[PDB]
């Protein structure tokens, strides 16, 4: 990990990086997710796994650095959005540029949030029994996760 | 037009895997059928209604014994969907005059000739 | 289309049920349905139907 220092003269210093735990359980896996047998076994709640692919201010790291495949990169990206919206990453908040403070508006607790709350409109005509409009819960990208329920998860609430 | 249906013969030609699944030998075929009505003939065509009465299956879930001969089988194929056909099995042999009054038909399809209502011990 | 039919993992198919009158199904089926085998409904063609 290299950091740029300015003085004009500016230079970048490379520092030693923490090393991955050796001897993955499943060597020969391309994606780092499959070298540890995590293909379908992580959700938004798993901050410990998700945090590793996140920039200090909450952005996702580029795929070419993480080494994830596209299928798992998109799942990590979506899980991170849901984790952020659930307030599970209090230390990866956006940087405040200058003369900006947090909105101070009270925070509503939410989880399994597919979309940004700003841009989702209210359902004014909810519909009757068979034309009921569904409130989406979870993400479609995680439709293949291992399920421990008798029936598949109820995405539309 | 809803009409009587003729099933292609291939349906009733079994496969080797079928014998393993149901545990029936293509040789030494079973002799007697155990047939029970498990559906209603209401909303079914009259020809299906007729055979069910001919075969004695007017009451549901009450078993009837029938011959495993082609003529009877032809009638059963007409109402195949309304019945369950189970092979009659005789673990201890045919009932005799002495044991005719001590028989019992088990749900397994076996006609025992001695029924004690006691622990096996 | 041919590959889908061969590798289908569903034991039950429209053709077998229709031809054998399983479930008493032909009460609710047209005479032409046996030929179509569920692929064609009215003037519509269903490619995903094997």
């Amino acid at each position: 990990l290299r950091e740029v220092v300015k003085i004009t003269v500016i230079e970048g210093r490379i520092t030693e990086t923490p090393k991955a735990t050796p001897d993955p359980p499943n060597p020969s896996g391309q994606c780092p997710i499959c070298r540890w047998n995590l293909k379908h076994k992580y959700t938004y709640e798993d901050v410990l796994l998700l945090s590793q692919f996140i920039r200090p201010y909450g952005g996702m790291l580029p795929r070419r650095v993480t080494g994830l495949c596209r299928e798992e990169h998109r799942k990590i990206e979506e899980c991170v959005k849901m984790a952020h919206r659930a307030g599970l990453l209090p230390n990866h908040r956006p940087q405040l540029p200058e003369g900006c403070l947090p909105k101070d508006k009270p925070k509503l607790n939410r989880y399994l949030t597919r979309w940004a709350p700003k841009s989702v409109k209210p359902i004014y005509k909810k519909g009757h029994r068979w034309n009921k409009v569904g409130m989406a819960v979870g993400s479609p990208l995680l439709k293949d996760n291992v399920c421990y329920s008798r029936r598949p998860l109820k995405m539309m609430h | 037009k809803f009409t009587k249906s003729r099933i292609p013969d291939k349906v009733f030609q079994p496969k080797p895997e079928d014998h393993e699944k149901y545990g029936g030998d293509p040789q030494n075929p079973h002799k007697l059928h155990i047939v029970t009505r498990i559906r209603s003939t209401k909303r079914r065509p009259y020809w299906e209604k007729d055979t069910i009465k001919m075969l004695g299956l007017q009451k549901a879930h009450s078993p009837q014994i029938h011959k495993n001969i082609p003529s009877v089988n032809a009638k059963l194929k007409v109402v195949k969907h309304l019945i369950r056909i189970q092979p009659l099995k005789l673990p201890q042999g045919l009932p005799t005059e002495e044991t005719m009054s001590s028989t019992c038909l088990k749900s397994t399809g076996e006609l025992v000739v001695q029924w004690h209502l006691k622990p096996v011990e | 289309q041919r590959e889908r039919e061969l590798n289908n993992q569903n034991p039950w198919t429209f053709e077998h049920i229709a031809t054998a009158n399983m479930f008493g199904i032909r009460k609710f089926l047209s005479p032409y349905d046996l030929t179509q085998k569920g692929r064609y409904w009215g003037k519509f063609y269903m490619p995903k139907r094997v």
């Binding site: 068979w130 029936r151 | 349906v11 009733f12 030609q13 079994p14 079928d18 149901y22 029936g24 293509p26 075929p29 079973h30 059928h33 498990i38 495993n68 089988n73 059963l76 194929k77 195949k80 969907h81 019945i83 369950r84 056909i85 189970q86 092979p87 | 039950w12 049920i17 054998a20 399983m22 479930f23």
Partner: peptide, 27 residues
Amino acid sequence: RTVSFQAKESMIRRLEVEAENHYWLSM
């Protein structure tokens, strides 16, 4: 009208019973 999960299974169970009926009428 989407077909329910319970409705689909109960038809399959009946089909299997009739499927066996084919086998026992073949000998």
